[PDB]
Ligand binder design. Sequence first.
Ligand SMILES: Cc1cn([C@H]2C[C@H](OP(=O)(O)O)[C@@H](COP(=O)(O)O)O2)c(=O)[nH]c1=O
Ligand SMILES: [Ca+2]
Length: 136
Amino acid sequence: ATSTKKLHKEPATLIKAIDGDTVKLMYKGQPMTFRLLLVDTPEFNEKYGPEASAFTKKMVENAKKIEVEFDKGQRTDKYGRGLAYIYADGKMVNEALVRQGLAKVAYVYKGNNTHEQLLEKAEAQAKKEKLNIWSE
Ligand SMILES: Cc1cn([C@H]2C[C@H](OP(=O)(O)O)[C@@H](COP(=O)(O)O)O2)c(=O)[nH]c1=O
Ligand SMILES: [Ca+2]
């Protein structure tokens, strides 16, 4: 029996926060726009959009340490964005959004589903707490 490498976190530096689920980072010395895996925040012009954007922006701008964690499948989307879990001082932004009710679990592809159950747990707690997108 053999194994594959576990997921691992790589450093990156903030260039700018874009919206609730998109952030531009300097990764291995080149700019890359990352789309957060497994999540969908409202668009800025939709209900809770601004709040989602602001939550991510604050999380990434206040972080001393940002990390990128690719999953085991596709690394880029069809628009060229990197697909990753993003951590800010050890806290997963993807998870934090979902837990706050500012993102839905979404875009769940079996190739890239490592934190599916973690995020579904967060979503269930956000729904029970009637936060944000779940408030009605
Ligand atoms: C999260 C994620 C998004 N996407 C793409 C699909 C959506 O484009 P299509 O609708 O053209 O398929 C797009 C949504 O991005 P935004 O939610 O940033 O608007 O993100 C992936 O392809 N893979 C993924 O894992
Ligand atoms: Ca979105």
